[PDB]
Design a binder for this molecule. Structure first.
Ligand SMILES: CN1CCN(c2ccc(OC(F)(F)F)c(Nc3nccc(-c4cc(C(N)=O)cn4C)n3)c2)CC1
Ligand SMILES: CN1CCN(c2ccc(OC(F)(F)F)c(Nc3nccc(-c4cc(C(N)=O)cn4C)n3)c2)CC1
Ligand SMILES: [Zn+2]
Ligand SMILES: [Zn+2]
Lengths: 290, 290
């Protein structure tokens, strides 16, 4: 029941609603354009009908709060927000090549160089967030968006949280992540390290072709995560495999920090493309020399 | 997109679909009638479109398996099931006075005698289930249905589980109960005692007017449950309050068993109506002597 047109009173810019793209939890998103400057954006549109509880509106506004404070090459650009009142509208940088999830659906396991290439950007993005005291808490493939140049852009700050004082441990995470860290479950509190754990799972998934703790039942996967029960297939190279293991460890203090990661042999001693062929959306790149 | 009419090939009985009643998780339920004997039932109708995964179909059939094995005055009667194939149909004893949830919405805190009356039936029902080696695992107000005589009927075996050998501890519970027990969370395994815990919360809720671990956030409530953080209001009688405390304890071995419960002073030494006025759906009964 969403307005074909979208007016921001405060900045008066007006937007035309374009094609549907997908979900946030409560949200539906569409392409939209600035109608005057004709510039195109993603609009994440949330019905106030799902926002009747103060707890849900705090989440909604905590997301805007965190996201609009952020500016970086590997984070989804926040261009603004407004509401009438059946809807909140958020205006985001449009990522024209969907996300890493669709890439994975279509390619399954990637070539090592491809994985280095994406993982670096994910890590740079995450370094920026950690400098600004933000933990994302749900890094996964469908959150890692791609622009026309196939550069990674972290988005969906729907579960992100700000560390307000040094040493703070968050005790709750209101929602259910994909790649969720041990300590979140064995609810002893969590901090920045949960994101490095996610990046471990993502790395496994990119290289192996499926996620490290998959089962027919979520609750089973959870048990498996609490027990650190996964195995790395023997055809994965050891440097890679070793880095995965560093990140996928139950004690958060033993994982690498995020600023520490790009220093790993996995990046320093392997090839990292400067850019990828658009063909790699569907065809494995061979990375020939001439 | 559900058939106005419903034919069981195997027993050939045919049903007319009547008015909508509410949800199971995946299910929608309606009144329905035997069209020939004109007898009325509740039909719990589940789209096979939500049953595409083997894990979901096991749950669905585990529920039927458990539920059709059951026959008792305080359990919802199973009359049968069949499917075409966009739907599974289950035929249940119709409870003409909705559930204890709607009662609570309308009366909030009940009189002690009313609570004894309902709690006894809930407990008899649960005793039958435990003799037959079934743990319900989601006893709550909206599961406790009422027939025209205001007798309690336990229903929704959507999360119930069978104890297959003596001493078995279940490690997972696939779903998210309302009144969920500590040990389920601190995932060290659980058994029959979780139901007595639920009955503790229900008793609190019936007597107090709201549940023992309420907060604006589920995950907060969970923490509160792990810490046993609740308090009983001082206007609740001590015998009652003491029984609540017996059930709401973190160690399952310390709670009463279900066969042990009706022996508690709370029942043995207080008044228990034989039947309730229909007026008590909306008016507090005074229980006058003449
Ligand atoms: C799981 N998939 C994730 C990526 N998807 C996807 C498909 C098409 C897209 O635009 C296009 F067509 F130009 F490329 C985009 N492009 C795009 N660009 C910027 C932001 C978002 C976005 C943010 C959120 C959120 N949870 O906050 C959800 N979405 C959507 N999506 C994303 C589809 C669903
Ligand atoms: C949360 N509330 C629980 C009880 N509700 C409710 C309202 C009207 C009703 O029938 C009538 F009209 F004759 F009284 C009934 N009557 C009724 N009778 C037998 C079974 C069920 C039932 C079982 C399940 C399940 N999860 O398996 C869901 N429902 C529904 N409901 C129940 C409405 C929703
Ligand atoms: Zn499951
Ligand atoms: Zn919450």
């Amino acid at each position: 029941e969403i307005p074909e047109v979208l007016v921001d009173p405060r900045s008066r810019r007006r937007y035309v609603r374009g094609r549907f793209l997908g979900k946030g939890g409560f949200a539906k998103c569409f392409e939209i354009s600035d109608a005057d400057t004709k510039e195109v954006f993603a609009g994440k549109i949330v019905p106030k009908s799902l926002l009747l509880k103060p707890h849900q509106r705090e989440k909604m506004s905590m997301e805007i709060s965190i996201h609009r404070s952020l500016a970086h090459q590997h984070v989804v650009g926040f261009h603004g927000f407004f509401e009438d009142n059946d809807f909140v509208f958020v205006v985001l940088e449009l990522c024209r090549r969907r996300s890493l999830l669709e890439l994975h659906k279509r390619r399954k396991a990637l070539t090592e160089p491809e994985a280095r290439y994406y993982l670096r950007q994910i890590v740079l993005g995450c370094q920026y967030l950690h400098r600004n005291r933000v933990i994302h808490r749900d890094l996964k493939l469908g959150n890692l968006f791609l622009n026309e140049d196939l550069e990674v852009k972290i988005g969906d700050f729907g579960l992100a949280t700000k560390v307000e004082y040094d040493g703070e441990r968050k005790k709750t995470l209101c929602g259910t992540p994909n790649y969720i860290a041990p300590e979140v479950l064995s609810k002893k509190g969590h901090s920045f390290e949960v994101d490095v754990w996610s990046i471990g799972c993502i790395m496994y998934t990119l290289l192996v072709g499926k996620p490290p703790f998959e089962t027919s039942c979520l609750k089973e996967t959870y048990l498996r995560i609490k027990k650190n029960e996964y195995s790395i297939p023997k055809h994965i190279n050891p440097v890679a495999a070793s880095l995965i293991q560093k990140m996928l460890q139950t004690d958060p203090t033993a994982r690498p920090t995020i600023n520490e990661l790009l220093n790993d042999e996995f990046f320093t001693s392997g090839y990292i493309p400067a850019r990828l062929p658009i063909t790699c959306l569907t065809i494995p790149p061979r990375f020939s020399i001439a």
